[PDB]
Copies of this chain bind each other. A is one copy, B any other.
Amino acid sequence: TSKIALFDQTLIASLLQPLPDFKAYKTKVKLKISEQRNETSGEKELKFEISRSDDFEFLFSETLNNEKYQILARDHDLTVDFDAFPKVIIQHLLCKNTEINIILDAEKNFCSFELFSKTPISKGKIFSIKLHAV
């Protein structure tokens, strides 16, 4: 396989899910970040994967190539390039007292993974990515 594991940790996240109105719980979630070669183009992809032992259906992922990352960087004001992005995010996740929100779709077809680094004035959202059900 071309898959290289970059990060694999159990983290605490806030899980928001509808009942229309949201119910909120802190939950341990396993986050995996890896790099891999796209089988059709051969280009480098980053893969984000989330799971949790509470629910076998709670299995979501998304792959990010350089082009999709450029959209993400534009949308979220990221100042690092695609090459530096996993390194800086992993350094943040292991160094900083960050906050994760996962907003679960009613039918568990997807979730929004949101990473924050709070400041005294604001939520400090770093980025968000839509993860699809596996």
A-B contact pairs, 5 of them (CB 8 A): A79-B123, A88-B120, A88-B121, A89-B121, A119-B124
Indicate whether A122 reaches chain B with its CB closer than 8 angstroms.
yes
A92 at the interface (CB under 8 A from B): yes
CB within 8 A of A79: which of B79, B88, B91, B118?
B118
**A80–B121 contact, CB under 8 A?**
yes
- As for how many copies of this chain the complex holds, the number is 2
CB-based nearest B residue for A125: B77
Alpha-carbon gap, A78 to B125, bound state (A): 11
Assess the A77–B122 pair: CB atoms within 8 A.
yes
Q: Give residues of chain A (50-98) contacting chain B, Cβ–Cβ below 8 Å.
A: 76-80, 85, 88-89, 91-92
A122→B126 contact, CB < 8 A: yes
Q: Is the CB of A124 within 8 A of B124?
A: yes
CB neighbours (8 Å) of A88 from chain B are 120-121
The reply on A34 being an interface residue by CB < 8 A is no
Any chain B CB within 8 A of the CB of A17? Answer: no
A117 close to chain B: CB less than 8 A: yes
A77 touches B123 (CB 8 A): yes
